[PDB]
Write a protein that binds this ligand. Structure first.
Ligand SMILES: NC(=O)c1cn([C@@H]2O[C@H](CO)[C@@H](O)[C@H]2O)c2ncnc(N)c12
Ligand SMILES: NC(=O)c1cn([C@@H]2O[C@H](CO)[C@@H](O)[C@H]2O)c2ncnc(N)c12
Ligand SMILES: NC(=O)c1cn([C@@H]2O[C@H](CO)[C@@H](O)[C@H]2O)c2ncnc(N)c12
Ligand SMILES: NC(=O)c1cn([C@@H]2O[C@H](CO)[C@@H](O)[C@H]2O)c2ncnc(N)c12
Ligand code: NA
Ligand code: NA
Lengths: 311, 314
């Protein structure tokens, strides 16, 4: 079972038909969707048939979201429901170039620091992997300390909170990680803020995964072995929100089904492009045949057959 | 009766405890998020009603408007002529304000776009000819059609395009100005209006009865076509919090003063008071009217005579 920690949110997503003080953008689309990094990854892992538990804090409004997730197989037992605060809110405007200007209001997310992974362990067993996703900062640290304490394997996934964290806090999130997930800009920011070199980082983790936007993804091992996977090319780009989360979910679902690194990253790339081609982060659909087809088109029929075999 | 046309909205207002000046992929971690009644026509109707004026709100909202409607009617606002869309939701304004009161916002029109289906002749028939029609930021075609109708039916109007000025072409702007009893803008909007229209300052003043140009912390200018200029400094703030709706508040206070028979300077002084009260609250309609506090801050800024004269007509 994969335990996903991180934000649970409502995403308010708008489209500006232009290209990015007193800035006002006239937007021509406004939709509200289920969101949060842990929401998104738990949803995708559940849709692809993995065993997954969502671990984070939401508000009393979470009931409908809860049903949505449970219908896809997500265990939400260990979602903390705040007595007073509302579920976090992400407000984002995306332009023609897929550039984005956003605000994030934590709300109930800040109470995630009150969750003890020991309860989840006691309730479902030791997880195969804990994803330490963008969350209340103290929660991210405490979750990581607990994984180290209880000997749980974890993925450091501090994407959107990296800008908000100090160098020392980042360094405390990385050591011992089975995986480090970031995008290339975040990778450079992590090196800068931590002062670590590339080699210093790779000495502390089992694998670095660096997404590269349209240039795909690198999976880098501490001995320098590098797998580069190009994207599943898009046909109808619409909103980039949640593409990183989808990639991580697909990749980790593939790993949990026993696929190798390259095959797992190819599955991740497929889920990523499906989210890119949807507005909300959890609005994509899983279609076995469409999946087989686009995997084959990008990566070859053998790769596609192997991937769809484990789903 | 003052007829207020323009946007009706829900405002989603957030505070960034930083500076946008310091900043493709911008994310602001905000420490406040509140949802409030909004839209320029909503805001000006609300303020005019709170100050005791006769006012009708004329614009388009969604089926969710019922609570808002009650809110406005309890303050004296006639909402009979709000058009409720069968399908669209009330417009949504989403705004993040930084420490310096700078702002980054998105506006989703929704039902606002149906305002072009409103005919001021119906409102005239139902309440009589308005004393003044405020042509506030709205669906662009609605702004044009409302202005054409005011000219047709001989209604006195205020050109108040503010936030839509950036979205309108020069020709559309020129069509909104001619014949206006008032032109309201801020100083940046005034420069943009001259640029996009190509008009000179004199070309504009030849077509309107009065220019009102707000200047942020530098107060407001009221300029007549013969160059007569009244400068009114602000009521100085004590607790700056969110600038949303400060312009609407000033316009409401000023026009309520004019409707109560005050002169230009006294009306602008009342406007300045309502403006600072909104500056000092988060939502645009969250301010409170306190007779004594009003008298006091008017006197502090403008002198005891001005304050007594203003509070007399309220
Ligand atoms: N841009 C931000 O600051 C954030 C956006 N999200 C979520 O990240 C998801 C996309 O990965 C969206 O569904 C959002 O809810 C966040 N989650 C946690 N912390 C944050 N600072 C953000
Ligand atoms: N910003 C991105 O990730 C992308 C931009 N074009 C893309 N095409 C396929 N996958 C992607 N992740 C992207
Ligand atoms: N920034 C924008 O583009 C707009 C903001 N508002 C409203 O303007 C009010 C403040 O004057 C707020 O209550 C908003 O609902 C608007 N109303 C009409 N048109 C617009 N383009 C805007
Ligand atoms: N005291 C005021 O009114 C103001 C102070 N800063 C302001 N900025 C814009 N408008 C205003 N009315 C003010
Ligand atoms: Na998306
Ligand atoms: Na305000």
């Amino acid at each position: 079972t994969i335990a996903v920690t991180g934000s649970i949110a409502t995403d308010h997503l708008m489209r500006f038909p232009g290209r990015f003080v007193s800035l006002s953008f006239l937007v021509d689309d406004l939709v509200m969707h289920r969101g949060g990094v842990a929401g998104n990854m738990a949803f995708a892992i559940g849709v692809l048939g993995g065993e997954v538990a969502l671990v984070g804090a939401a508000g009393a409004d979470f009931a409908d979201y809860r049903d949505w997730l449970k219908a896809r197989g997500v265990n939400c037992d260990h979602v903390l429901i705040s007595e007073t605060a509302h579920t976090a809110r992400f407000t984002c405007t995306t332009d023609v170039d897929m550039a984005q200007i956003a605000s994030f209001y934590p709300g109930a997310m800040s109470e995630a620091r009150n969750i003890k992974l020991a309860d989840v362990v006691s309730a479902i067993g030791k997880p195969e992997l804990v994803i330490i996703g963008a969350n209340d900062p103290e929660a991210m640290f405490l979750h990581t300390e607990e994984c180290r304490k209880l000997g749980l394997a974890f993925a450091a996934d501090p994407s959107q909170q990296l800008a908000r964290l100090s160098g020392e806090e980042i360094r405390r999130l990385v050591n011992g990680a089975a995986y480090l997930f970031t995008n290339d800009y975040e990778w450079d920011l992590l090196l800068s803020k931590t002062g670590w070199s590339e080699a210093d980082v790779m000495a502390q983790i089992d694998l670095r995964v660096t997404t590269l936007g349209p240039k795909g993804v690198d999976l880098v091992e501490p001995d320098g072995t590098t797998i580069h996977v190009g994207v599943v090319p898009e046909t109808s780009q619409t909103d980039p929100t949640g593409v990183g989360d989808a990639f991580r979910a697909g990749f980790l679902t593939g790993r949990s089904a026993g696929l190798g690194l390259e095959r797992s990253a190819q599955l991740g790339s497929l889920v990523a492009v499906l989210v890119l081609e949807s507005t909300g982060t959890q609005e994509w659909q899983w279609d076995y045949e469409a999946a087989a087809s686009r995997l084959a088109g990008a990566y070859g029929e053998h790769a596609a057959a192997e991937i769809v075999a484990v789903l």
